[PDB]
Each structure stands twice: as structure tokens, then as C-alpha cells.
Amino acid sequence: VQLVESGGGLVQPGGSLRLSCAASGFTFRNSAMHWVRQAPGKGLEWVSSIWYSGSNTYYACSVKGRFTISRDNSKNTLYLQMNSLTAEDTAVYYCARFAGGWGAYDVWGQGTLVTVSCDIVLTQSPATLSLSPGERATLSCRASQSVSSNYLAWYQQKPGQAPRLLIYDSSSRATGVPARFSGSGSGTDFTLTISSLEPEDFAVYYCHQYSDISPTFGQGTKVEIK
């Protein structure tokens, strides 16, 4: 009684792969068959299920509209057709026989890895600054490698609004930006200093490097009232 899995491998986003699972040792046509996946370092996640011709196939929302489950009972084979793949679909994929009250997922395929794949990382600190008006906020943006030509910008974002450019070229204030916003630093260490905070200044602030063709943003620092 076993499920012999086949397929997988490394593809580019938008590509497609077909997985298969050959069953033996049980009456295949009577069993419901599921796909389950597990992203690297993550937990198990149901993907899709299929039972008998005329009963419903089901899909997790994560794959619905792109993946197709099917079976060929004469071949004792379960399939998963994976179309328009995304990097987020990277995972080990398992087929499993579903035994319901007689055993949940009691037979598993060995799993096959599907990897979908095609960089300056900005780390902002701290994540949150709880401060009062009149005080000074100092925001740090550290880059995993040197940011060429000080091509670093800071944006302010209020809730429900588009980002607003504050600083570009690490230290140049954009039009309309008050002197109490000050950018500085170089190489891998950049800071935004906001002196004598006003209530309007409480917002999220993102740093942005445009020193290469793969632009990156920090994860933001939220400055909030105390």
C-alpha cells in the first residue's frame, strides 16, 4: 500500500509543472485523494482534494484558479497540474490518501520539491517609536551592502494615503519638507532625524534604496504618540 510520487523541480515564475502520484495496494477508485504542501521551514497546508467522477474537487484559495487536480483510475494515478506558478508556490508537495474516519491521511507520497525562482536588504530600527510632541525621533536604516552614490530616500506615509517623499540622495529635502526633517549617513548606515515632533508627524517612515535595478524598501518605522 503506497503512493509513488513523480515530478517537481526548479522553474521560473509563470511557468508550469505537472505532478503525479501512482497508487498501489488499495482500490484506488474508492478513495479520496488530496494534495498537501509545505513551504521550506513552514507547516503543512492543504492544497486540493478529489474523490469520484461527479463529486466535487476542492481547492485552497492559495491555488484556486491556477492548479487543477485530476485522476486517471485506469492508471491508478493522481495528478496536480500547476499553472502560472509563483515564488510563493515553492514547497514540498505531497499526495495523500484520505481515509476520513478510518484514518485521516493514512498513506503519504514521499514528497517532491517545487521551487519557483528568478539584493540590498534594508533593516529599519526600531520598528516602533512611541514619542510625545516636541521630542526628537531618530530612525535608522541599515543596508546589507553599500548604497552607491547615497541613492537613498525617505518617505512618510499617513494612514489611507500614498507615500510622501521626504528626503532623496540621503540628505536632500524634497519640496515643501520642513527643516525639522533631516537625512544623513552613507555607505550602509543612514538615519532620518525628526526634531520637535508635531502631531502631524506621527506616521510610518520607509527608507528606499535606488542604487541598483532591484529597488528595495525597509519595512518601515512607525512613529506614534505616547
Binding site for a copy of itself (CB under 8 A): 12-15, 34, 43-46, 49, 56, 58, 60-66, 83-88, 94, 98-106, 108-111, 117-118, 149, 151, 153, 155, 157, 162-165, 168-169, 174, 206, 208, 210, 213-220
C-alpha cell at 71: 485522476
Distance from the Cα of residue 38 to its chain's centroid:
14
DSSP classification of residue 83: -
**Residue placing its CB nearer to a copy of itself in the complex, 8 or 218:** 218
Closest distance between a copy of itself and the C-beta of residue 74, in Å?
26
Nearer to a copy of itself, 54 or 101 (CB): 101
Closest to a copy of itself by CB, 125 vs 196, is 125
- Residues 6+ positions from 63 with CB-CB distance below 8 Å: 47, 48, 82, 89
**How many CA atoms are closer than 13 Å to the CA of 217, on its beta-carbon side?**
10
Least distance (Å) between residue 87 CB and a copy of itself: 5
Residue closer to a copy of itself (CB basis): 30 or 132:
30
For residue 27, how many C-alpha atoms fall within 13 Å in the half-sphere facing its CB? 2
Q: Which of 198, 188, 193, 196 is nearest to 218 (CA)?
A: 188
Residue 62 and residue 221: Cα distance in Å, rounded? 30
Which is nearer to a copy of itself, 120 or 134 (by Cβ)? 120
The distance of closest approach from Cβ of residue 130 to a copy of itself in the complex, given in angstroms and rounded to an integer, is: 18
Minimum CB–partner distance for residue 218 and a copy of itself (Å): 7
